[PDB]
């Protein structure tokens, strides 16, 4: 709004909050008042209804004081980027690569390949008199179309896009609005993953360090994999199908993993969740019945999510009054929208305080985040043990406060991004000391204590001592075990302070043992083999003392999973048969990442 004047940034008694009398956005972008993620006034985003005011990135004070992402280079590693879009072009810097054609132009040829362009607009749509306003409208973009339908997702291309090349090395934000859904557990130790983890480490920890931002996934209810869609049928507990620790990349620490929030201020229906979520950011729903993300589309009414042959109930689409060339859409969503929301927030902070490290920025975002949905309840799992003890155990936490006073939930991480408050804290921030990565401590488990009984009376437990005084930032765990029905397992970690974190919630999507039995007649997966998980729950706590891993089999009932063949439309039922034998914990390893206070 042109009536929203700049602030000096020094106004005495300024309310920087989500309900401030001073809450407005400068700018003449005609669609910016429908970008609820910038400022949520209960507007509908061209969908059938609006949400609840205040549920946004709380970035209005950044915008009113000229904090706009200037000098910050962002890489969008995605399906493409229409670099000639009128509301993006001014912010495109040299170095994009089309990994399919080899050109410097990652513009898609496929009308539905609008994802990367939509992502890009959330970050950095140009501040002008057309379209939308980016979160960080002075940030500079490159695009690398790794997710183009004709990209084989080659290692050389991942390296090129994610900081290894001359072109991409000087980005300070790497936006990764993508992930891998799995039905069988993976080790994180493969050479391809090790190589990228090493790159991300080097890129994060250098001068002018780069922040990797990563989508948690959209698998609360359903996952898609290799032309099939899977979801649980029945009336099981409301635990995520995709826990965000299932994709091995999401536990690498260098990735800041984000869940999605809707315009009502609660977890977007589809969002994956887990102990490795760092923050919640804006992703919306679908833009049909309720708000999604108004952003830049592939240009023209022949390309993109806003195109003549792909109608939407979103009112912005095919609308000659509001968007005659169909250059914008109102349906962008997902953790793929939470990711650029966070990339943009990061770019704002970096532009305001260019000397701060990635770990400093994480600290500021965590300590300033809003505790949305404060009363949401833990999700309990009920079963009867072999001794007839009826148990009710926590399968997913609500909000909990750790021993260092940090509020955390697996749904929202440290909470919803509050850019204004992060900037308030940044003005007085003192730099964190260097990152210390403690050596992995491996615990091989033997004898009777290794057993994981069906429907256990208590967890199978294993403990190790960390001797080093360290303030925790994150913990990584690798687990190896045998068990015939993996989703029966609840895996939890306990710190020396007694703080608990569920690393893997049960009834997740690791149904591959059942799928293998049905499809093949034999089972490839014996259990977990160095499966990696991360928790943020312990941020700020002392590492010194005993850490305990707990694993429990919490189900003996049958479960069914619906399998959809996307091509044929054939629906199959997969039955998960209870494990006939007890499982066995083989080993686990603990890595503490933190600093010396």
């Amino acid at each position: 709004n042109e009536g929203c004047a700049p602030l000096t940034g020094k106004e005495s008694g300024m309310d920087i909050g989500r309900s401030s009398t001073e809450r407005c956005l400068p700018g003449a972008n005609p669609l910016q008042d429908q970008q609820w993620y910038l400022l949520n006034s209960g507007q509908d985003g061209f969908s059938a209804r609006g949400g609840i005011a205040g549920n946004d990135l709380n970035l209005w004070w950044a915008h009113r004081t000229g904090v706009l992402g200037q000098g910050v280079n962002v890489a969008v590693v995605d399906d493409g980027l229409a670099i000639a879009h009128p509301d993006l072009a001014d912010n495109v810097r040299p170095g994009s690569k089309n990994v399919v054609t080899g050109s410097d132009d990652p513009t898609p040829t496929d009308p539905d390949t609008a994802h990367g362009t939509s992502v890009s607009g959330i970050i950095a749509a140009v501040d002008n008199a057309i379209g939308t306003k980016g979160i960080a409208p002075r940030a500079q973009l490159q695009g690398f179309n790794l997710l183009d339908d004709n990209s084989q997702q080659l290692q050389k291309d991942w390296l090129y896009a994610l900081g290894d090349s001359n072109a991409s090395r000087d980005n300070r934000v790497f936006n990764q609005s993508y992930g891998m859904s799995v039905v069988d557990p993976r080790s994180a130790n493969s050479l391809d993953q090790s190589q990228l983890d090493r790159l991300f480490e080097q890129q994060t920890l250098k001068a002018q360090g780069a922040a990797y931002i990563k989508a948690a996934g959209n698998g609360f209810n359903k996952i898609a994999a290799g032309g099939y869609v899977l979801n649980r049928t029945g009336n099981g507990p409301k635990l995520p199908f995709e826990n965000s620790n299932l994709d091995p990349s999401n536990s690498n620490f260098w990735n800041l993993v984000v869940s999605a929030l809707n315009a009502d201020g609660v977890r977007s229906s589809y969002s994956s969740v887990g102990s490795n979520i760092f923050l919640s950011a804006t992703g919306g729903e679908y833009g049909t019945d309720t708000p999604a993300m108004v952003t830049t589309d592939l240009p023209g009414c022949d390309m993109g999510y806003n195109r003549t042959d792909d109608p939407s109930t979103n009112r912005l689409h095919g609308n000659s009054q509001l968007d005659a060339s169909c250059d914008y859409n109102g349906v962008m969503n997902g953790t793929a929208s939470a990711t650029p929301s966070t990339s943009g927030a990061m770019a704002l902070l970096m532009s305001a305080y260019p000397d701060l490290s990635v770990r400093d920025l994480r600290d500021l975002l965590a300590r300033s985040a809003t505790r949305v949905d404060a009363k949401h309840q833990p999700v309990m799992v009920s079963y009867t043990s072999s001794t007839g003890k009826v148990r009710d155990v926590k399968g997913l936490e609500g909000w909990e406060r750790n021993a260092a006073g940090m509020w955390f939930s697996p749904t929202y991480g440290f909470g919803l991004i509050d850019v204004n408050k992060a900037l308030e804290l940044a003005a007085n921030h003192q730099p964190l000391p260097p990152l210390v990565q403690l050596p992995w401590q491996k615990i091989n488990v033997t004898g009777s204590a290794a057993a994981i009984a069906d429907v256990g009376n208590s967890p199978t437990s294993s403990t190790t001592r960390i001797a080093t005084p360290l303030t925790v930032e994150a913990v990584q765990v690798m687990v190896s075990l045998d068990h015939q029905r993996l989703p029966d397992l609840l895996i939890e970690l306990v710190s020396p302070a007694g703080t608990r974190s569920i690393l893997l919630s049960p009834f997740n999507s690791l149904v591959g043992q059942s799928l293998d039995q049905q499809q093949l007649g034999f089972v490839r997966t014996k259990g977990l083999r160095d499966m990696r998980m991360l928790s943020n729950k312990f941020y700020g706590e002392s590492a010194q003392g005993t850490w305990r891993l707990e694993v429990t089999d919490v189900a003996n009932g049958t479960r069914q999973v619906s399998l959809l063949n996307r091509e044929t439309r054939e629906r199959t039922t997969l039955t998960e048969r209870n494990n006939r034998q007890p499982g066995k914990l083989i080993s686990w390893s603990l890595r503490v990442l933190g600093h010396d206070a």
């Binding site: 399906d79 039905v183 090790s194 099939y228 799928l515």
Partner: protein
Amino acid sequence: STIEVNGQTYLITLRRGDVLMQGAASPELTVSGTLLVEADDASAKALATRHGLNFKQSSGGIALLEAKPGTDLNAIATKLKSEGVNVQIELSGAEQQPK
């Protein structure tokens, strides 16, 4: 048939362009022709010429070597393993998905 690649079981020598299925809820994978090898540049270069491979590039102590047409990558990988070298045959495809 079943085939062991990178310590895991797939469904079908392994040559560039060969297609592998990893059960029925996973993307189709393709042998790209590239091998990842954990070795320094000089060691990786010596390993490449003395195994009939082309050194392409490296990062983080891991080299990318490309196999020439006709090369059986599985035979190369098993040999390298026996020599105490960590090796991964690249299996490409649509593993990462837009969220």
